[PDB]
Every structure is written in structure tokens, then in C-alpha cells.
Symmetry: D2
Subunit: 115 residues, 4 copies
């Protein structure tokens, strides 16, 4: 699993469950093409987005649908979504964990990249 | 000044100086139109992006050019840039400060909205 | 003002107002002696804690009374307080800003050190 | 495993390996008694600190030795350590993950609490 997304809720101290995630890959025409999508599990994790074969070098955008998450909890948050844009696999295949920690008016994102 | 941007460097414990910032407004055609831009000052702040008259309700994107910042310091970063996407709402007089704290493999962003 | 404290609220997107802050200096007997204290202002800032003459090199602890802050808002928090422990060094003229961003189950702290 | 500690490095985008962690529990005499200690693994995680039987209700302090970690990497960081102080098990037994994300002049900590 070369690309995993993990989302946590800083208000409740819990995984952020059922968060929609959309991944895009930049195409030669300077356009974002849909690449993979899913929702976080009860553990706040989203596995199985892609395979080593399909996850080639490129610029990828991970959009985490934070506004939909907060609204379902009755909170009107500031951001529309969190976007994580990065070059992947430019030095060869790597495994990427994109983690996000969410509050209504703030979020943090970190990448853990392993060989 | 209804919209200000402040950027900090978590590696050096300093304002992030000379960081390029581009602001876009979402247009009816589902496209990002350039709205304002600048570079952060010696205090890490970018003032004067817009006016009360021009900063109407809508969806805005603030792109912070973090990759160039780390490259100028000789540090290998993860993200292409940091993107902050939000709706501006007329809920009474408001000032929006978009703050970002930068590390090579992580960033956090918060909105401070005051009257 | 060589030492300033700034506190933000990541749930409301606002300065954290009326937060008690206590500063201690490490004494030779491996004990924390009270040094300065106050409450954050309407801007979330606490100025005037010390002077250049009194703020000598040493180990300092800044305790931010986060639990009382969340309790006043009716939100159940995790931490008893946030603690920031650091050495102050005479590396030339310096001003220290200790910033903290608060959520019920998470906080971040950064030092901005400027000349 | 009712108490686990996870540490990440925001400069390298990696687990923070070999980070020393000391846990203390507040005793009736208003004193911190040593409770457990260990070092993070190659995955940045520290398991096996305590048992359900020994991890009773109380106020606990988790000290993460961040300064020693950064110095071994040739970085002089701002903080002496990160301290996480919290009441545990006051509503019955819970499982606690204390996560910390480290940069030289900044850190963030979050708790994930599950039943
Ligand atoms: O940038 C973030 O999203 C972030 C993430 C963590 C964190 C990382 C990994 C993990 F397993 C748990 C966490 F809380 C802790 C703090 C933080 O700011
Ligand atoms: O999410 C962020 O960008 C963030 C910002 C701050 C911060 C905000 C405002 C300020 F004047 C100083 C700061 F360190 C402190 C911590 C933090 O995580």
C-alpha cells in the first residue's frame, strides 16, 4: 500500500471516521485527473487507494473533505477542504502516509515517507 | 485590511520572509481566477492584499509557495505548496488572518477571524 | 518586552482571551520558582511579563491554563495545561514569542525568536 | 496496552526513533512519582509502558525528551522537552495514544482516547 491517508479529530480526540478523500494526479495538459478516492474507516485510515504499478512518478493532490465532516457533527468550519499537493516517487518508489489533524478553524498535515 | 496572511518557520523559529502568496477567487465556471498576490515581509506578514469593497462573499484559495522557500534554505521539502481554501461570509464586520506554520514535511494553518 | 505569549483558539478561530499564564524559572535546587504571570488580553496576547534586566539566561517554563479555558466554554478538554519548557540564551539581542494554538484534545506551540 | 506514545519528525517526514519518554503520576503529596519509561521504536512508537491494572485513575505527565533527539541530529532546538499532562481513567478505563509531531522550534501533541 504505497499511499495511505489518516485523519484525526482534535476536538473529540478520536479518529475522524467516514471522511471523504479524493486523489488527483497532474496530467501533461496541466490538468488534475481523478486518480483514486475513498472514505476513512473506523480507525480514521484509508487504505487501498492505489497499487505500486499505478502509483507512478508525478504531482498528486490529496483533497480531504473536511467541511462535510464537521457539518455532520453540527459544526460550521472555516475550510472547504484540506489539500495536500506533493511530488511522489521522483527518487523511486516510496510509501506515503498523509496524516491530517482537524479542528473547525485549523488543520495540520504531515507526510511520513518510507523506503 | 480584511485579509492578511502570516507565515512562520518552525525549523528556525522565525517569521518566514519573502514567501510568495497567491490568492484566487472561485468563479462561476468552477475555475480559480487570480485575485491578489505578494510576498511576506520581514515579519512574515502580507498586508494590503484586498479592500473591503472588493472582498465580497465567495470561495477563496490562498496558495503559499512553500517549496521555493525551503529550496532557498537548502532543505528538501515535501509539499509543492500549501493551499488554504475557505468561504468568506458576511456575518457582520470581519477581518481574516490566515496563518501558516511551516516545516519541511508538515504544515499547519489556522484562521483567526475577528470583528 | 523580551518575552511575550500569544494564544489562539482553533475551534472558534479566535484569540484565546482571559487565559491564565504562569512563568517559572528553574532554580539551582531543581525546583520551579514563580517568575511572572498574567492573563491573555482580548487579542490573545500577554505582554509585560518581564524586563531585559530580569530575563537572564536559564531554563524557563511557561504554563498555559488550558483546562479552565475549555471549561468556561463548556467543552471537555484533555490536558490539564500546556507546558512549554525552554532555555533562554544570550546569542545577541533576542525577543521570544511563545505561541500556542489550542484544541480540546491537541495543542501546538512554537517559539518565534527575533532580533 | 492502555498507554502508547507515538513520535514523528516533521523535518525528515519519518518516525522519530530512539526518543526517550518518561511518564510520571501525581502522588497524594503533590509530587510527581516515576511511573514508566522507555524509548520509541523504529516505527516511532513506544508500547508496553504499563498494564490495565497499574494504570489507575490519576494525573499523569508524559515527558518526551525532544532536545536529546534533535541534538543527536546536529540541531540545537528550542524546547527542553515536550510535556503532556492529563487526567486519565476518570470515567473508567480508557486506551490513550499520545502523539507528538516535532520540529526544532515547534511541536504539536494530540491524544486519541478510545473505549
Ligand atoms: O500534522 C498533523 O496532522 C499532526 C499529526 C499528528 C499525528 C500523526 C500521526 C499519528 F499516528 C497521530 C497523530 F496525532 C500529531 C500532530 C500533528 O500536528
Ligand atoms: O496552524 C498554525 O499555522 C499555527 C499558528 C501559530 C501562530 C499563529 C499566530 C501567531 F501570531 C503566531 C503563531 F505561532 C501557532 C501554532 C500553529 O499550529
Amino acid at each position: 500500500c504505497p499511499l495511505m491517508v489518516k485523519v484525526l479529530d482534535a476536538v473529540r480526540g478520536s479518529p475522524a471516521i467516514n471522511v471523504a478523500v479524493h486523489v488527483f494526479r497532474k496530467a501533461a495538459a496541466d490538468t488534475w485527473e481523478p486518480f483514486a478516492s475513498g472514505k476513512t474507516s473506523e480507525s480514521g485510515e484509508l487504505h487501498g487507494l492505489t497499487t505500486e504499478e499505478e502509483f507512478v512518478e508525478g504531482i498528486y493532490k490529496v483533497e480531504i473533505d473536511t467541511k462535510s465532516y464537521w457539518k455532520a457533527l453540527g459544526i460550521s468550519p472555516f475550510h472547504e477542504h484540506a489539500e495536500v499537493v506533493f511530488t511522489a516517487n521522483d527518487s523511486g518508489p516510496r510509501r506515503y502516509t498523509i496524516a491530517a489533524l482537524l479542528s473547525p478553524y485549523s488543520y495540520s498535515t504531515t507526510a511520513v515517507v518510507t523506503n
